[PDB]
Design a protein around this nucleic acid. Structure first.
Lengths: 34, 55, 59, 329, 64, 493, 56, 171
RNA sequence: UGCGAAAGCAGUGAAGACAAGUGGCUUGUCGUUCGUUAAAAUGGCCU
């Protein structure tokens, strides 16, 4: 592949490469609006 | 059927209805299963091509 | 079919309301209608494309 | 006209409590102003003829006080969705304004009566009324530490009130229309602005002289001043935001706006800002994207130009591309 | 992929699935998706399976 | 899932002298009307501005034909010798006609009764008269006095310039289309002389040496002119003063030329030329003036024209022969209550936020063979193949789809004597052509492999097989002797 | 300085056992059926049904 | 105030329906676009607006289920052989039901449809049905989330209208 | 099956079990094993 690496394909077809109160209220409101 | 249904009959206890016409096949409709009976549902059970031209 | 053809009847009594619609309520050629499920609120849409909105103050 | 009746940021400016009408019943919603840190569940009012006049945040489970129009302040916890308590004045007049300092809550009435409740005791301490102030619709508690001296009411004409003597100690020439905003700016100045005018005026609370007169270019709807009086961001009637930069320094008597922000869509459609919020170096503007859902934007206002316009992505003819389908259908 | 209406025995067909069907089952609570497995028998050098669900509404492949 | 892909028609490799798009466009100029004039049709020009009329010069009458009905609308008869030239002004408001007595009569177009003025030019026959293309009040008349003239049509007593300097029988004018001072005249001694009019005018500024006597000279671009005379036309860059193309693809002398630009055509610009031998030919000045199409008429074609670049209607090609006749070829171009009820069907959603669009674009209608193949009726696909008026590549493509897709024997099971005769009746003609002969081969192979006993029983197809054998013998004789000619071409390597 | 790695995936690897027709599919939908959890021989891809992208 | 006084319609208003919970109004007509309006008295403002090309809607209906009250579909139909279900969650995700599962002879348009609830009654699972009015006497009832044909009720004569009655049984 | 070109050149069994027909016999089969490099149930494709 054209950026100085070489890619290979396995036989189980895996491609590989060789290369170089506030936060409490906030959490409770986001949990109540969930 | 694929075309007209010229003649059709039933059995004694009305658990089967057989039917046939100009597309030379006989269809059998069944109501034997007790769920089909208590729900009063017929099913297109089977189909036989045994004739030559019509019935 | 005709202009301003809408009536509100009151049931059980089945007696049509006499004070609305009057001759100057802009119903138009009433072609669809829907009551709102909560506020007591008619919405009547006519042939020229105008949903007019009334609020039934009893609710 | 805009579908949102009431809106107020909390202090720290991270939640906006906004009261709208939803098919002849008003409802109170609370939205977080930056999600990176939609809320679906409101508090509906029950009657069609009961309606929220004024609203204020308390700072300590966080809650709102909604001054209603039947003479009751509803204290409403936002983390539940029920009203915690209903403070009731003895009468049925709509209450025009509330303000709190600590655990002490003051409300004005439309019978021109002043009521003091203790939010810790849940009781009405003091009920009184003062001569020659008779169409009040705003009060502010001048912060004097733990002491809750010096109310400041406005009736088209501001007047400063000693409460332990129950009298008017100074009177200020206000406007010609009823006052709509009345806010304390430092511990000696206050800004005031009226219904349907574009002239704010800041008064000295010790002498009475108008220091300065701030001129927006459209009718002022709401304002929010920064925490140290170096900025005042007014949201106007045409839906623009105008930032007066350091409005208390030496444009000698009447000052125009320093920065002016508006929002347009990709179409050209100007969407209007309601109720923005300024602080140090960071400004939070807000608008309504669909019919009644608030959207927000945090703008670093110190480095944007004078005349600024956000260009937001709002649908106008966008061809509906389902994600399960390429362009040729 | 045929689906048989078992009352009156009526099939609805989905005819060109670019792989033979070796598993099909309905998936959702109200049966909105159908999960299918296509075995793609053109190359006999390998058994390569395309997994496919699709929604029953318009029978478009949601997430192949 | 997928849409079922169409049945592809069977396109075999292409053959020489195929249809280029340029000759397709030119070949659809049809319905050639002939008009018998009385004498040789010397000149023909077009209206420029609303270019919808053309003036044809027969002898002693000029006929304005119209390009909506191709008949004479107006006629000019009141000449006193043979009329030679007829041209419309650049605006189309008036018409000049040069005569064989040297009397350039200018009428107004679309009114033959008002002779606007009459220039008494030189005593010899004036032969070419045309207005300036850029200016609108000078008129160039050249005669058999070897001098062209630029008259001003206000002062029609003395010419505003008198372009002398020629040696034999000036017959053609042109003007250079950007520089309006530059007059390119052409005479019977080659020598396309051209003049700057600011100077004296008795001396051309340079002379372009056509060899043969020129018969016409037009200007194509602002910078290159085309002069025709003798068997060839030669194109000349004016700036480089240089001949840079030449075509001599005619038998007799090129009589006349004209040129169209940026009209609705695959050929962006076109130079058509008329050459005394029946042939009028079109050359494409973009791919080095190559010929692209041509017509042949029943005599010496003496003048030709085509309807100009902004014709906007019925597009005409006229050629007037010296035989006395003329050929024209053209290419042609509930209630208010109910509507108020059913109003909004024309909307298409301008102010609407989202727009959905899933309506499938309705494709071409499937033919009988294609829908029978798609329903897997293969014998019926063959029956639908062998209908009478069916295209030959369509019969070939359904034979190919049956052969490749399935099994020819499956398509050929239930046959007998009357239902096999259409197949072999087509196979007789289809064993000729090279695109079809291999498919006809293995089709007839399996049909004799399946129906051997009917060749015993039915005698209706025995002689069909015999005549098939004769046609196979014919084409194998040709398919061996073509190999012989291929060998005796290989020897000549 | 040349090192070998593997980056990209392969086959989704259903139950390649005999005698089990029908449910030879391992892949599941979530309860709030927004994402489709399908194994491979190499990774457990969770696709998202709303946007057709592998999300994690 | 007139509910579509904000954004005017470009045709007659053939169908009009309020949302069951939210303060929304859906309007639709033969200009093949359907508009939702958050209504109140003061400013009835346009929430959104979808223009389904070439499919002029006759009947449109807000539908929410009894299972979670978080479906919020919009079903629209007109004189075409398909129906649209716009899934609401505030691009748009719409599905097009065009398969009558073998019963296409007895349903030539989807115009007169209604939406109703139905229980499985071997489980206690509700879902939604859409009931189309067909040609002969037919009411073709089909599932709302999967589009499958469930049953069909034929009457004698010429079918003109129908409705849905619910009656409780137990918890 | 091997080798090769797209042509072609070399090379092709035994057990176990079951059924049928006449404990035996005979044939055929195998979601049984070892070795050799070794056609059919009226049943066809969406809007």
């Amino acid at each position: 592949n054209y950026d100085t690496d070489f890619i290979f394909l396995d036989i189980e077809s895996t491609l590989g490469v060789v290369g170089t109160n506030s936060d409490i209220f906030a959490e409770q409101l986001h949990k109540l609006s969930s | 059927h694929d075309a007209d249904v010229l003649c059709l009959t039933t059995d004694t206890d009305n658990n089967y209805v057989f039917s046939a016409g100009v597309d030379r096949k006989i269809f059998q409709f069944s109501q034997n299963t007790n769920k089909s009976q208590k729900n009063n549902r017929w099913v297109n059970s089977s189909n036989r091509l045994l004739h030559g031209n019509d019935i | 079919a005709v202009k301003d053809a809408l009536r509100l009847v009151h049931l059980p009594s089945c007696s049509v309301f006499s004070n609305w619609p009057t001759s100057g309520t802009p119903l138009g050629k009433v072609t669809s209608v829907a009551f709102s499920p909560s506020g007591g609120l008619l919405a009547v849409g006519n042939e020229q494309g105008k949903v007019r909105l009334w609020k039934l103050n009893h609710y | 006209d805009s579908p949102v009746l009431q809106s107020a940021y909390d202090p720290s400016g991270q939640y906006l409590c906004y009261v709208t009408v939803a098919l002849d019943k008003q409802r109170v919603g609370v939205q977080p102003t930056q999600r990176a840190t939609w809320n679906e569940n409101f508090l509906y009012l029950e009657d069609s003829k009961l309606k929220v006049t004024c609203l204020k945040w308390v700072n300590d489970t966080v809650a709102i006080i909604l001054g209603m129009n039947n003479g009751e302040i509803w204290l409403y916890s936002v983390l539940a969705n029920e009203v915690t308590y209903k403070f009731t004045t003895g009468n049925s007049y709509e209450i025009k304004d509330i303000d709190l300092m600590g655990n002490q809550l003051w409300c004005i009435d439309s019978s021109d009566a002043f009521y003091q409740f203790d939010l810790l005791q849940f009781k009405l301490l003091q009920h009184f009324r003062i001569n020659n102030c008779v169409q009040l619709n705003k009060l502010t508690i001048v912060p004097a530490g733990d002491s809750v001296a010096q109310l400041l009411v406005a009736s088209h004409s501001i007047s400063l009130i000693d409460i332990e003597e129950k009298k008017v100690v100074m009177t200020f020439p206000g406007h010609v229309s009823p006052v709509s905003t009345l806010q304390v700016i430092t511990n000696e100045f206050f800004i005031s602005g009226a219904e349907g005018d574009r002239f704010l005026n800041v008064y000295d609370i010790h002498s009475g002289m108008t220091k300065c007169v701030l001129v927006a270019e459209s009718d002022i709807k709401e304002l929010s001043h920064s925490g140290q009086a170096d900025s005042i961001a007014v949201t106007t009637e045409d839906g623009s935001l105008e930032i007066f930069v350091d409005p208390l320094v030496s444009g000698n008597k009447s000052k125009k706006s320093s920065k002016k922000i508006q929002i347009v869509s990709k179409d050209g459609r100007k969407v209007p800002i309601y109720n923005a919020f300024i602080n140090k170096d960071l400004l939070n503007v807000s608008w309504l994207q669909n019919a009644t859902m608030p959207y927000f934007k945090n703008l670093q206002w110190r480095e944007i130009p004078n005349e600024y316009t956000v260009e937001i992505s709002l649908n106008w003819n966008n061809k509906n591309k389902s994600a399960d389908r390429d362009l040729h259908g | 992929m045929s689906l048989w209406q078992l009352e009156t025995n009526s099939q609805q067909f989905l005819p060109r699935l670019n792989g033979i069907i070796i598993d099909c089952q309905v998936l959702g609570p109200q049966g909105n998706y159908y999960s299918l497995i296509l075995q793609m028998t053109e190359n006999n050098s390998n058994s390569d399976y395309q997994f496919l669900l699709l929604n029953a509404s318009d029978l478009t492949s949601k997430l192949s | 899932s997928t849409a079922r892909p169409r049945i592809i028609t069977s396109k075999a490799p292409l053959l020489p002298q195929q249809t280029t798009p340029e000759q397709r466009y030119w070949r659809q100029y049809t319905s050639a009307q002939l008009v018998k004039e009385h004498n040789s049709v010397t000149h023909i020009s077009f209206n420029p501005q609303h270019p919808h009329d053309f003036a044809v010069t027969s002898s002693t009458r000029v006929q304005i034909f119209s390009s909506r009905t191709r008949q004479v609308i107006k006629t000019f008869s009141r000449f006193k010798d043979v009329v030679y030239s007829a041209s419309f002004r650049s605006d189309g408001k008036l018409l000049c006609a040069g005569d064989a007595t040297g009397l350039v009569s200018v009428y107004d177009s679309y009114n033959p009764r008002t002779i606007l003025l009459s220039i008494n030019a030189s005593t010899h026959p004036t032969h070419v008269t045309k207005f300036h293309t850029q200016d609108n009040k000078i008129l160039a008349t050249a005669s058999d006095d070897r001098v062209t003239r630029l008259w001003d049509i206000s002062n029609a007593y003395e010419p505003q310039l008198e372009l002398t300097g020629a040696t034999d029988y000036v017959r053609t004018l042109s003007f250079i289309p950007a520089a309006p001072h530059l007059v390119a005249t052409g005479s019977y001694d080659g020598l396309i002389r051209l003049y700057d009019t600011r100077s004296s005018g008795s001396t051309p500024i340079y002379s372009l040496n056509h060899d043969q006597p020129v018969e016409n000279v037009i200007a194509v671009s602002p910078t290159q002119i085309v002069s025709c005379g003798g068997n060839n036309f030669k194109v000349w860059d004016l700036t480089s003063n240089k001949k840079l193309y030449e075509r001599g693809n005619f038998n007799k002398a090129v009589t006349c030329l004209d040129y169209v630009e940026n009209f609705d055509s695959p050929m962006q610009s076109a130079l058509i030329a008329s050459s005394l031998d029946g042939h009028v030919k079109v050359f494409d000045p973009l791919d080095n003036f190559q010929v692209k199409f041509g017509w042949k008429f029943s005599g010496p074609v003496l003048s030709c024209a085509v309807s100009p670049s902004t014709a906007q209607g019925n597009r005409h090609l006229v050629a007037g022969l010296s035989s006395g006749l003329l050929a024209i070829r053209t290419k042609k171009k509930k209630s208010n209550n109910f509507q108020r009820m059913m109003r909004g069907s024309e909307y298409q959603g301008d102010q609407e936020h989202i727009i959905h669009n899933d309506k499938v674009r309705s494709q071409r209608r499937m033919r009988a063979f294609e829908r029978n193949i798609n329903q897997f009726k293969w014998s019926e696909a063959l029956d639908n193949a062998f209908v009478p008026g069916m295209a030959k590549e369509l019969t070939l493509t359904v034979l190919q789809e049956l052969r490749k897709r399935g099994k020819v024997r499956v398509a050929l099971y239930g046959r007998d004597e009357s239902t096999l005769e259409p197949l072999l009746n087509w196979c007789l003609k289809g064993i000729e052509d090279v695109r079809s002969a291999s498919i006809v081969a293995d089709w007839v192979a399996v049909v004799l492999e399946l129906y051997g006993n009917t060749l015993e029983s039915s005698p209706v197809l025995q002689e069909l097989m015999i005549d098939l054998k004769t046609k196979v013998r014919h084409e194998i004789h040709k398919s061996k002797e073509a190999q012989r000619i291929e060998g005796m071409l290989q020897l000549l390597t | 300085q040349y090192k070998l790695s593997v980056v990209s995936g392969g086959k989704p690897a259903l139950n390649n056992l005999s005698s089990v027709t029908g449910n030879k599919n391992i892949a599941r939908l979530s309860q709030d059926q927004r994402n489709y959890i399908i194994p491979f021989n190499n990774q457990i891809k969770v696709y998202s049904v709303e946007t057709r992208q592998c999300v994690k | 105030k007139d509910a579509n006084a904000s954004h005017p319609s470009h045709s007659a208003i053939q169908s009009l329906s309020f949302h069951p919970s939210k303060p929304l109004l859906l309007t639709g007509g033969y200009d093949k676009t359907l508009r939702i309006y958050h209504i109140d008295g003061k400013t009835n403002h346009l929430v959104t607006s979808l223009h389904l090309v070439g499919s002029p809607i006759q009947t449109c209906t807000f539908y929410t289920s009894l299972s979670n009250q978080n479906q919020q579909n919009i079903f629209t139909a007109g004189r075409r052989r398909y129906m649209h279900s716009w899934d609401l969650s505030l691009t748009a995700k719409i599905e097009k039901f065009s398969r009558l599962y073998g019963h296409e002879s007895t349903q030539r348009s989807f115009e007169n449809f209604k939406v109703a609830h139905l229980q499985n009654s071997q489980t206690n699972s509700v879902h939604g049905i859409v009931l189309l009015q067909g040609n002969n006497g037919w009411i073709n009832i089909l599932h709302s989330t999967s589009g499958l044909w469930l049953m069909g009720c034929k009457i004698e004569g010429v079918i003109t209208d129908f409705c849905i009655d619910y009656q409780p049984i137990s918890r």
